[PDB]
Design a protein around this ligand. Structure first.
Ligand SMILES: O=P(O)(O)O[C@H]1[C@H](OP(=O)(O)O)[C@@H](OP(=O)(O)O)[C@@H](OP(=O)(O)O)[C@H](OP(=O)(O)O)[C@H]1OP(=O)(O)O
Lengths: 605, 561, 397, 142
C-alpha cells in the first residue's frame, strides 16, 4: 500500500515518550500542510497517503484543522483506493462548511449515478455513516428508487436498505410510505439471504409507526423462517455458522414478527407453531459441536423465539415448553445461559399460562443460587424466587434465603434481608413463624434490618404469651455467640429484661449468666443501646433479687454514674436511686410487665 | 480458538527477532520493550528462552535488564523463574560484586520448593564475600530463606552466620543482620538471640553513630525489645542514644524515644539523670513537627501517647502544637488532641484564644472539633471554666448556625460539672431558639430548661413548643423532652399538669419505640405509686405541700387520640 | 516490613508495582483502590489499616504511591522511605507525573530491587546509587474591583451548591452519575484583599458528563488558588465531577405484575449519609401505568397520594437522618384488554436537599490578606454553607 | 440497534472505533475510557453482557484485545456475541492469522470490513464466504 504510512506509524511506535510522539506528529503535520499548500501538485498516491495520515493522527487524539478539501477531491478520482480513503475521512471528520457539503453531495450524486456497484456502495455507505439533513434532502428520494429497481445488484440493495433505514431514523419526514412499500416487502423472498437480512432490519423499524403498510411481511417472514429452521446440511452453506442455519436472519425474522399480533390467517399461525416447535426441539438435541459458538448461535434463536412466544402470550403449550427449556439451562457451565434463563423466567412468572410452570423450577433456582459465583446471576435468582413466591412457597423461600444468609457474601445481604422481611409480613402463617424468622433475620443480618422491623417483632412478643419463652431462648442462645449484631443486643436485651424470668429456671441461663452476657456486650455498644441495657439491668434488680448487688456495682461505677452522655448519666442515677430509695413493693409496680401494645390496623392481623 | 495469538507475525515475532540480533545494542532495546510490555500485562511468555539467551553476555546493562525481567516473574509466576536456576548459581561465581548480590536477591525472591537444592551453598560464599554490598544482600537473603519451608538446622548455622555478621567492618551489613534476625526471631519458637550481648549492644551503639540512616531504625527497634536488670545497665544505653536527636528526621528520633521511654522507668525515677533526659526529649520531638505533613501525623500520634504518661516532658513547649490554616485535617486534629492534654492554668490565656482563632474559620469540620475542645479545656481545669464560657457566648453572637449549635451543647456539658453557677446565661441562650435544626443542640436546650425550670418562669411555654412535632424529632430529643417535662412537673405541679399528659401519653400510647414506651410507663408508674419516691429518684442534691402534686396526678389520664 | 509497593494514576489504575511477601496478592492492590483512591464518604489519613493489613500512601500531583505491610511495622520508617524514593525518582526525571512513570518503567524497576530488599529501606541516596543502576531517566519538556472599598465589618460567605444526578438499575448498579457544582462567594471586605482558597483533592483541574472546572477571571493558579475577589456576590468556580460521588439515597424498587389485573409495588429508600445530618424536602415519584383503576397506598413515614393527571404516586418526607430506611407499599388495579405489548416502565425519581456536597468537595481554608488597611484574617467573620440538591435522580424499575 | 463498536487492548488503546450515534469528540473519549474501565475488570467467569449507561455492552477478549458492541437493552445478547466472533473470523482470514499490528498498519482496510458486516447500526452481511470474496475483489482494484 503506502510505504510512507507504515514509516509514520512505526516511527510513532519507536517513540519512548508522549513528548517525542508529539514531536513526530507535528513534523508529519508540517510536511502534509507544506505539500497541500506547496507549489508542485501531488499525484493521487500522495493525496491518498497524506489524507490517510491525517485520519490516523485524528484517531490518536490530535485536532486536524485542514485537509478536508484534499479528501473531497479524492471522491472524484476513478481510482477505488483514492475514493475509499476520501470517503473514509469525511465519514470520521464531519465538518459544517457548506461549500464542502455541496461538493460532497456532488461526488455522491456522480457515484449513485455511475452504474458501478463499488462506487455506489461507497456513496450509500457515506450517507448511512454521516446521515446529514443536507444528505437526506439530497438523496432520500433516490434511495428507495435504487432499493426497488430490478437491475441494481444485491450488495447495492443491502447497502441501500440500511442507508434508507438510517435516513428514516435521522429524517423520517423525507421517507413517506410511497410506491415502494410492497416491493421492499417482496425482498423477503430474495435468493440472497444478505438482502433478506437487510430488508428485515428496515421493515422492522418501518412496521412500528406504519404497521398497516407492512402487514403482508408477516406471511413471508413465517414462510422464510420455516424454510430456514427445517433445512438440511447442504442447504444454506453460505449462511451456516457452526452447524446452525442462518442464525442472525432467524433472529431478525422472529423480531419482525414481534411487531404484529399472531397471524390472522390460521395456515400461517400453523406454519409459525410448527416453526417454534422445531426451534424448541433443536434445544433438546445434543450439541453437533463442542464449540461454544454452536450453542450460542442455536440459543440466540431459541431466546428470540421465546420473546415471540412471550409477546404473543397466545399458545400455552409453547409457554410451558419455553419454561421447562429455561429450567434445564439453570444447570449449565455457561454463566451466560444461566443469566438469560433466570431473566426470561422472571418475565414468564407474570403470565398466568406460565406462572404455575415457573414454580415447578423453585428446586433448580434455589440450588443454582447456593452454587452460583457470578453476583449478577445470584441477584436474578433472588428476583425469580421473589416473583414466584406465594402462600405455598413462602416458608420454603424464606427458609432457604435465611440458610443462604448464614454463609453469604456481603455483596447481596442487603437485598435478601429486605426480601425476607417483606415476605415474612405478606405471608405470615402465624405469630411464632414470623417471630422465628425476624429473630433469626436479626441474629444473622441485623446490621441491614430496619428499625421499623425490630420495633414490630418486640410488639409481637409482648402481645402473645405463647412465643415469649421461644423469644427468650432463641435470643439468649444467639446472644452467647462470640460476636453478634448490635440490633440483636437491642432485641436481645429488651426481650430478656421483660421475659428473662421464663428461662432463668435453667442453670444454662441464670440471672448472673444473663446479666454478665448482656454486660459483656455493653462497653462495645452504641449509647441508645447502652441506655436500653440499663432499663434491662433495673428490670433485672426487680425480677432477680440474687444479683441486685453486682448490678448496683455497675450503676455506681464512674463510667455509668459520671457519663459524658445525658440519657446514660440520668438512667444510671435514676436506676441506682430506685434500687435504694424504693422498697421491694414499690419497685415491683414501677417495673411490672409492660401492658400489651394498642393493636391498630398498621400491621397485625 | 487461538485468534490474535499468532507467533509468526505481530509484536512478539518482531521482538523475538530483535532478541536474536547479533548487534547487542538492539538486544538491550528488545529486553526493555519486553519489560515495558509485562508492566501493561502482555503475554511475553513465548519469549522466555530468547530473553534468557541475552544473559550469554559480558555486558553489565544487558545482563541486569534480563534479571529485572525474571524478577517481575518471581513475584507473580514463581514457577516460570525456576527454569533459570543454573544461571544464579554461576552468577554468584562471576568476578563482579554487582552481579554477585544480583544472583542472590533473585533466587531468594523465588518462592516455590526446589529452590533449596540450588541456593544454600552459594549463600555460604556471599556471607563470607570480599564485598559489603554482597554481604548486606545475603544477610537479607537469610531472612528470605527462613520465609520458605523447612526451619533447616543448617539455617540454625545461618543464624550464627547472621550473628557472625553483627560483628563486621560495615554497619550496613550489621544494619541488615539486626533487621533480618528480629524478623526471623518473631517466628517459630521464641528466645533465639538474647545472647550475653553487652558487646552485641556495644557493636550496635557504635553502629548507631556511623550507620546509613535506615540501619539505626532497624537497630533502635531491637534495643527497645529488651528489659535491662539494673539501673546503670539501662542508664548507660540511654547515654549513647543521646545523639539520635536528628538522624533520618523522624524514622530514628522516634525509635530512639521508644527506647528512652522504656529505659526511663527502669531508671530509679531518681531525678539525678532522669531529670537531664526529660529536658533533652523536648527539642527533638518538636523538630519532627516541621517535616513532611504525613510524618507530623505519626509523630503527633506517638507524642499524644508519650504525653498521656509524662505530660511535663512538654509542659513547656505547648507553643509548637497550635494549628496552621494549611495543615491537613488529620494533623489539625492530632495537634488539637495534644493542646487539650497540655492545658495548664498558665497557658489557657493563649490556648482558649487559639481555639477561638479556629472556631472562626471556613473548615466546618475542624471548627466543630475546636468548640467541643473548649469544653475539654473547662472540664479538665476548673479555674478557666469562667474564661471558656466567655469564648462560647462570643461565638454564639457571630450568629454562625453550626458554631452556635456546637457551643450551646458544650455549655450544657459545663452546666453539668459546674452547677447553680452559670445562670444569667439561660435567658441569653434562648434568644437563638428559632434556628436549632441539629437534634443534639435541641436536646441540650431541652435539658437546660429541665434543670433550671425554677430559674425561668418562661420554661412552661418553651417545652410545649417542642411537643408540637414530637414525632419527626430525634428519639434522643423525645427522651430528653420526656425527662425534662417530668422535671418541670416535679418542680411546679399545677401549671404543668398540662404538659405531663401528652408527653407521658405519646411515650406510652403513640410511639412504637419500646425504649421510649418503657420510660413513659416507668415515669407514669413513679408519679402514680407515690410522688415522693418519684421526687427523690428524679432530682439530685444542691450546690409539706404535696397536696398540689397529688391533686394533679389524680387529674391526668393518657390517650392516643 | 514493606510487603508491597504500588503506583496508581488519578483513575486508580496501577501504573507500576512490586510485591515482596505473599500476603499481598490481588487481595491488596484492590483494598487500597476501593477504600482510599475511590473513598467516597471518608475524610482519610495517611495510614489505613484494612483487616490485618496496613496501608501508607503519599500523593504526588496525579499519582498515588502506596506501601502495604500485612504485619504492623515502624510507621515513620515506611513514610521516610517513600519520601526518599520520590527523592531518587525526581533526581532521574523531575516531576513525579503519570507520563514520567510511563517513560521510565524499566528505570523504576531497577530502583525498587535496590532502594528496598524484601521490604527493608536500603541506601536510597543518589551518590551511593550511580554505581548499581544502569538505566538513566527520560525527562521531557484591577478590572473587577473598585479602589477605596471600606466596611465597619469585613465578612465573607461561601456557598457550595451541588446538583447530583443518577441513573440506577433496579439491582442498584450505578449506570451513570454526575455532579454539577459551583462555589458562590459573597465578600464585604475593605480594601483590596489577596485571598488564598484551599479545598480537598476532589475537583481535578442523552449527553455524557465530562469532569471539568472553570474559575472566575480573578483567579490565579498554584494545592490552592488565590485571587482579589470582586465586591459582594460572584461565582468563584463552576465544575462537574463523575468519579467517586456520594449518592445521598438508594431507591430499592420491588414491582410485581400479578397477571394483568393487580400491580404490587413496594419502594424502600435508604439515606446513605452520616447519622447526624438531615436531608430535607424529600420527594419520591413512583410512576403508574396509563390504565389505572383505583390505588391503595400505605406509608409509615411521611404522606403520599396518587396524582392521576401526572400518572404517578407522589410520596413526601419532611426530614430524614442518615442510615435510616422508609417503605411505601401500593396496590394498583388495571382494566386492560389493550395491545399485546405491556407497560414499558418509566423510572422512579427523587427530589431532596442535603447539607453536604455530593462531590465530596470540602472548603479547608480561606486566608484574607490586605497590605494597606489595618485588618487581617483573624478579624474577618466567615460563614460556609453546603447545599446539595437532587438533579435528575432516576432509578429504573 | 448498534450504537458503537470498539476494539481496545488491555492497555486501553483503541484499535477501531465506529459510531452509529451522534457524539462530541469529548463524549467519545469519555465513552471509550468508561468502556475500558467496565470490561478489563471482569475475569473469564463473568457474563459477556453488562448494562452500560442506558444501553448495554456485549464483549469477548481475543488475546490482548477486547471486541465490544454497545447495543439497546432489548437487543439479543447471544446474536451480538456471535456477531463479534463471526467478524473476528472474517478479520482472521482477510489478514492470514490476524495480529493486533494488522489492525494498526491497516486501520483504513478494517473500516471496510466493519462496513461490510455492519451498517446503520444493524447486522448487514454474516456470510464469511461472501464478505471475503468481496474483500479480496476490492483489494485488487487500483
Ligand atoms: O515512501 P513514499 O510513500 O513513497 O513517500 C516518500 C516520503 O514521503 P513521506 O514520508 O512524506 O510520506 C519522503 O521520504 P521520507 O520523508 O519518508 O524519507 C520523500 O519526500 P521528500 O523527500 O520530498 O520529503 C519521498 O519523495 P522523494 O522522491 O523526493 O524522496 C517520498 O517518495 P516518493 O516521492 O517516491 O513517493
Amino acid at each position: 500500500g503506502m510505504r510512507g504510512l507504515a514509516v509514520f506509524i512505526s516511527d510513532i511506535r519507536n517513540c519512548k515518550s508522549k513528548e517525542a510522539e508529539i514531536k513526530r506528529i507535528n513534523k508529519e503535520l508540517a510536511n502534509i500542510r507544506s505539500k497541500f499548500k506547496g507549489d508542485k501538485a501531488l499525484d493521487g498516491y500522495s493525496k491518498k497517503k497524506y489524507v490517510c495520515k491525517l485520519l490516523f493522527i485524528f484517531l490518536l487524539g490530535h485536532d486536524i484543522d485542514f485537509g478536508h478539501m484534499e479528501a473531497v477531491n479524492l471522491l472524484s478520482s476513478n481510482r477505488y483506493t483514492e475514493k475509499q480513503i476520501g470517503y473514509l475521512f469525511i465519514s470520521v471528520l464531519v465538518n459544517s462548511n457548506s461549500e464542502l457539503i455541496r461538493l460532497i453531495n456532488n461526488a455522491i450524486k456522480n457515484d449513485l449515478a455511475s452504474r458501478n456497484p463499488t462506487f455506489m456502495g461507497l456513496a450509500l455507505h457515506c450517507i448511512a455513516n454521516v446521515g446529514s439533513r443536507e444528505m437526506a434532502e439530497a438523496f432520500a428520494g433516490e434511495i428507495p428508487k435504487i432499493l426497488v429497481a430490478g437491475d441494481t445488484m444485491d450488495s447495492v440493495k443491502q447497502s441501500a436498505a440500511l442507508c434508507l433505514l438510517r435516513l428514516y431514523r435521522t429524517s423520517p419526514d423525507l421517507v413517506p410510505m410511497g410506491d415502494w412499500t410492497s416491493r421492499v416487502v417482496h425482498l423477503l423472498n430474495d435468493q440472497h439471504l444478505g438482502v433478506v437480512t437487510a430488508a428485515t432490519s428496515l421493515i422492522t423499524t418501518l412496521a412500528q409507526k406504519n404497521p398497516e403498510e407492512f402487514k403482508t411481511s408477516v406471511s413471508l417472514a413465517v414462510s422464510r423462517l420455516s424454510r430456514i429452521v427445517t433445512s438440511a446440511s447442504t442447504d444454506l452453506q453460505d449462511y451456516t455458522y457452526y452447524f446452525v442455519p442462518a442464525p442472525w436472519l432467524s433472529v431478525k425474522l422472529l423480531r419482525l414478527l414481534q411487531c404484529y399480533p399472531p397471524p390472522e390467517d390460521p395456515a400461517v399461525r400453523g406454519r409459525l407453531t410448527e416453526c417454534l416447535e422445531t426451534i424448541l426441539n433443536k434445544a433438546q438435541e445434543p450439541p453437533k459441536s463442542k464449540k461454544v459458538q454452536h450453542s450460542n448461535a442455536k440459543n440466540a434463536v431459541l431466546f428470540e423465539a421465546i420473546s415471540l412466544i412471550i409477546h404473543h402470550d397466545s399458545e400455552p403449550n409453547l409457554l410451558v415448553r419455553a419454561c421447562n427449556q429455561l429450567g434445564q439451562f439453570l444447570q449449565h457451565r455457561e454463566t451466560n445461559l444461566r443469566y438469560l434463563a433466570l431473566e426470561s423466567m422472571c418475565t414468564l412468572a407474570s403470565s398466568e399460562f406460565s406462572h404455575e410452570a415457573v414454580k415447578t423450577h423453585i428446586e433448580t433456582v434455589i440450588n443454582a443460587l447456593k452454587t452460583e459465583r457470578d453476583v449478577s446471576v445470584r441477584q436474578r435468582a433472588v428476583d425469580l424466587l421473589y416473583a414466584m413466591c406465594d402462600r405455598s412457597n413462602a416458608q420454603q423461600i424464606v427458609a432457604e434465603m435465611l440458610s443462604y444468609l448464614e454463609t453469604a457474601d456481603y455483596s447481596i445481604r442487603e437485598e435478601i434481608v429486605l426480601k425476607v422481611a417483606i415476605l415474612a409480613e405478606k405471608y405470615a402463617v402465624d405469630y411464632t413463624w414470623y417471630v422465628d424468622t425476624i429473630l433469626n433475620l436479626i441474629r444473622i443480618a441485623g446490621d441491614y434490618v430496619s428499625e421499623e422491623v425490630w420495633y414490630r417483632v418486640i410488639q409481637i412478643v409482648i402481645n402473645r404469651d405463647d412465643v415469649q419463652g421461644y423469644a427468650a431462648k432463641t435470643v439468649f442462645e444467639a446472644l452467647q455467640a462470640p460476636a453478634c449484631h448490635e440490633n440483636l443486643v437491642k432485641v436481645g436485651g429488651y426481650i430478656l429484661g421483660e421475659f428473662g424470668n421464663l428461662i432463668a429456671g435453667d442453670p444454662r441461663s441464670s440471672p448472673l449468666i444473663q446479666f454478665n452476657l448482656l454486660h459483656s456486650k455493653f462497653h462495645l455498644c452504641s449509647v441508645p443501646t447502652r441506655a436500653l441495657l440499663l432499663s434491662t439491668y433495673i428490670k433485672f434488680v426487680n425480677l432477680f433479687p440474687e444479683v441486685k448487688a453486682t448490678i448496683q456495682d455497675v450503676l455506681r461505677s464512674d463510667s455509668q454514674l459520671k457519663n459524658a452522655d445525658v440519657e446514660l448519666q440520668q438512667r444510671a442515677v435514676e436506676y441506682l436511686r430506685l434500687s435504694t430509695v424504693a422498697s421491694t413493693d414499690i419497685l415491683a409496680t414501677v417495673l411490672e410487665e409492660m401492658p400489651p401494645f394498642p393493636e391498630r390496623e398498621s400491621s397485625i392481623l | 480458538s487461538k485468534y490474535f495469538t499468532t507467533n509468526k507475525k505481530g509484536e512478539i515475532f518482531e521482538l523475538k527477532a530483535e532478541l536474536n540480533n547479533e548487534k547487542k545494542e538492539k538486544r538491550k532495546e528488545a529486553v526493555k520493550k519486553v519489560i515495558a510490555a509485562m508492566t501493561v500485562g502482555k503475554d511475553v511468555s513465548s519469549l522466555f528462552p530468547d530473553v534468557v539467551n541475552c544473559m550469554q553476555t559480558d555486558n553489565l546493562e544487558l545482563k541486569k535488564l534480563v534479571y529485572l525481567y525474571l524478577m517481575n516473574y518471581a513475584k507473580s509466576q514463581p514457577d516460570m523463574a525456576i527454569m533459570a536456576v543454573n544461571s544464579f548459581v554461576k552468577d554468584c561465581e562471576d568476578p563482579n560484586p554487582l552481579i554477585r548480590a544480583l544472583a542472590v536477591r533473585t533466587m531468594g525472591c523465588i518462592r516455590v520448593d526446589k529452590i533449596t537444592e540450588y541456593l544454600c551453598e552459594p549463600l555460604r560464599k556471599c556471607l563470607k564475600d570480599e564485598d559489603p554490598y554482597v554481604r548486606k544482600t545475603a544477610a537479607v537473603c537469610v531472612a528470605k530463606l527462613h520465609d520458605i519451608n523447612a526451619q533447616m538446622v543448617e539455617d540454625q548455622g545461618f543464624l550464627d552466620s547472621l550473628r557472625d555478621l553483627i560483628a563486621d567492618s560495615n554497619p550496613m551489613v550489621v544494619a541488615n543482620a539486626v533487621a533480618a534476625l528480629s524478623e526471623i526471631s518473631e517466628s517459630h519458637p521464641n528466645s533465639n538471640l538474647l545472647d550475653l550481648n553487652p558487646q552485641n549492644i556495644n557493636k550496635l551503639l557504635t553502629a548507631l553513630n556511623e550507620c546509613t540512616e535506615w540501619g539505626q531504625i532497624f537497630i533502635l527497634d531491637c534495643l527497645s525489645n529488651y528489659n535491662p536488670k539494673d539501673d546503670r545497665e539501662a542508664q548507660s544505653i540511654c547515654e549513647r542514644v543521646t545523639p539520635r536527636l536528628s538522624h533520618a528526621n523522624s524514622a530514628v528520633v522516634l525509635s530512639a524515644v521508644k527506647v528512652l521511654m522504656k529505659f526511663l522507668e527502669l531508671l530509679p525515677k531518681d531525678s539525678d539523670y532522669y531529670n537531664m533526659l526529660l529536658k533533652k526529649l523536648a527539642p527533638p520531638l518538636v523538630t519532627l513537627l516541621s517535616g513532611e505533613p504525613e510524618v507530623q501525623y505519626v509523630a503527633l500520634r506517638n507524642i499524644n501517647l508519650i504525653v498521656q504518661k509524662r505530660p511535663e516532658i512538654l509542659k513547656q513547649e505547648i507553643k509548637v502544637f497550635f494549628v496552621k490554616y494549611n495543615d491537613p485535617i488529620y494533623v489539625k486534629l492530632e495537634k488539637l488532641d495534644i493542646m487539650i492534654r497540655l492545658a495548664s492554668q498558665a497557658n489557657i490565656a493563649q490556648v482558649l484564644a487559639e481555639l477561638k482563632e479556629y472556631a472562626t474559620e471556613v473548615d466546618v469540620d475542624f471548627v466543630r472539633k475546636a468548640v467541643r475542645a473548649i469544653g475539654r479545656c473547662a472540664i479538665k481545669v476548673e479555674q478557666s471554666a469562667e474564661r471558656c464560657v466567655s469564648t462560647l457566648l462570643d461565638l454564639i453572637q457571630t450568629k454562625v448556625n453550626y458554631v452556635v449549635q456546637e457551643a450551646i451543647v458544650v455549655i450544657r456539658d459545663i452546666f453539668r460539672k459546674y452547677p447553680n453557677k452559670y445562670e444569667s446565661i439561660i435567658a441569653t441562650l434562648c434568644e437563638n431558639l428559632d434556628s436549632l435544626d441539629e437534634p443534639d443542640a435541641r436536646a441540650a436546650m431541652i435539658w437546660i430548661v429541665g434543670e433550671y425550670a425554677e430559674r425561668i418562669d418562661n420554661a412552661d411555654e418553651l417545652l410545649e413548643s417542642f411537643l408540637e412535632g414530637f414525632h419527626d424529632e430525634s428519639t434522643q430529643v423525645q427522651l430528653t423532652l420526656l425527662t425534662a417535662i417530668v422535671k418541670l412537673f416535679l418542680k411546679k405541679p399545677s401549671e404543668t399538669q398540662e404538659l405531663v399528659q401528652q408527653v407521658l401519653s405519646l411515650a406510652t400510647q403513640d410511639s412504637d419505640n419500646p425504649d421510649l414506651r418503657d420510660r413513659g410507663y416507668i415515669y407514669w408508674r413513679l408519679l402514680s405509686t407515690d410522688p415522693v419516691t418519684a421526687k427523690e429518684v428524679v432530682l439530685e442534691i444542691k450546690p409539706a405541700s404535696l397536696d398540689e402534686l397529688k391533686v394533679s396526678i389524680g387529674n391526668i389520664t393518657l390517650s392516643p387520640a | 516490613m514493606i510487603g508491597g509497593l504500588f503506583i496508581y494514576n488519578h483513575k486508580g489504575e496501577v501504573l507500576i508495582s512490586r510485591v515482596y511477601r505473599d500476603d499481598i496478592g490481588r487481595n491488596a492492590v484492590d483494598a487500597f483502590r476501593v477504600n482510599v483512591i475511590h473513598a467516597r464518604q471518608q475524610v482519610r489519613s495517611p495510614v489505613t489499616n484494612i483487616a490485618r493489613t496496613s496501608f501508607f500512601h503519599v500523593k504526588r500531583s496525579n499519582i498515588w504511591l502506596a506501601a502495604v505491610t500485612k504485619q504492623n511495622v515502624n510507621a515513620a520508617m515506611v513514610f521516610e522511605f517513600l519520601y526518599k524514593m520520590c527523592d531518587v525518582m525526581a533526581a532521574y526525571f523531575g516531576k513525579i507525573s503519570e507520563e514520567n512513570i510511563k517513560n521510565n518503567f524499566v528505570l523504576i524497576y531497577e530502583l525498587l530491587d535496590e532502594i528496598l530488599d524484601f521490604g527493608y529501606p536500603q541506601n536510597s541516596e543518589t551518590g551511593a546509587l550511580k554505581t548499581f543502576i544502569t538505566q538513566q531517566g527520560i525527562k521531557s519538556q484591577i478590572g473587577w474591583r473598585r479602589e477605596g472599598i471600606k466596611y465597619r465589618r469585613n465578612e465573607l460567605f461561601l456557598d457550595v451548591l451541588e446538583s447530583v444526578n443518577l441513573l440506577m438499575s433496579p439491582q442498584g448498579q450505578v449506570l451513570s452519575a454526575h455532579v454539577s457544582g459551583r462555589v458562590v462567594m459573597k465578600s464585604y471586605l475593605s480594601g483590596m484583599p489577596e485571598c488564598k482558597f484551599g479545598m480537598n483533592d476532589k475537583i481535578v483541574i442523552q449527553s455524557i458528563a465530562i469532569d471539568d472546572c472553570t474559575f472566575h477571571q480573578c483567579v490565579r493558579l498554584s494545592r490552592s488558588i488565590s485571587f482579589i475577589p470582586p465586591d459582594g456576590e460572584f461565582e468563584l468556580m463552576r465544575y462537574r465531577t463523575t468519579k467517586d460521588i456520594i449518592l445521598p439515597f438508594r431507591v430499592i424498587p420491588l414491582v410485581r405484575e400479578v397477571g394483568r389485573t393487580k400491580l404490587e409495588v413496594k419502594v424502600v429508600i435508604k439515606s446513605n449519609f452520616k447519622p447526624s445530618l438531615l436531608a430535607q424536602k424529600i420527594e419520591v415519584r413512583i410512576p403508574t401505568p396509563l390504565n389505572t383503576s383505583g390505588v391503595q397506598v400505605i406509608c409509615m413515614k411521611g404522606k403520599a397520594k396518587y396524582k392521576a393527571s401526572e400518572n404517578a404516586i407522589v410520596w413526601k418526607i419532611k426530614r430524614m437522618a442518615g442510615m435510616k430506611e422508609s417503605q411505601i407499599s401500593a396496590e394498583i388495579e388495571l382494566l386492560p384488554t389493550n395491545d399485546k405489548k405491556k407497560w414499558a416502565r418509566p423510572p422512579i425519581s427523587m427530589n431532596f436537599e442535603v447539607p453536604f456536597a455530593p462531590s465530596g468537595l470540602k472548603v479547608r481554608y480561606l486566608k484574607v490578606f490586605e497590605p494597606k488597611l489595618n485588618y487581617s484574617d483573624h478579624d474577618v467573620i466567615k460563614w460556609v454553607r453546603y447545599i446539595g440538591r437532587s438533579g435528575i435522580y432516576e432509578t429504573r424499575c | 440497534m448498534i450504537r458503537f463498536i470498539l476494539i481496545q487492548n488491555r492497555a486501553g488503546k483503541t484499535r477501531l472505533a465506529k459510531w452509529y450515534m451522534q457524539f462530541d469528540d469529548d463524549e467519545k473519549q469519555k465513552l471509550i475510557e468508561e468502556v475500558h474501565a467496565v470490561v478489563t475488570v471482569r475475569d473469564a467467569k463473568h457474563t459477556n453482557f453488562v448494562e452500560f449507561r442506558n444501553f448495554k455492552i456485549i464483549y469477548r477478549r481475543y488475546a490482548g484485545l477486547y471486541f465490544c458492541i454497545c447495543v439497546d437493552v432489548n437487543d439479543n445478547n447471544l446474536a451480538y456475541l456471535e456477531a463479534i466472533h463471526n467478524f473476528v473470523e472474517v478479520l482472521n482470514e482477510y489478514f492470514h492469522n490476524v495480529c493486533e499490528l494488522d489492525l494498526v498498519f491497516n486501520f483504513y482496510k478494517v473500516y471496510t470490513v466493519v462496513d461490510e458486516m455492519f451498517l446503520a447500526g444493524e447486522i448487514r452481511e454474516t456470510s464469511q464466504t461472501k464478505v471475503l470474496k468481496q474483500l479480496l475483489m476490492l483489494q485488487s482494484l487500483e
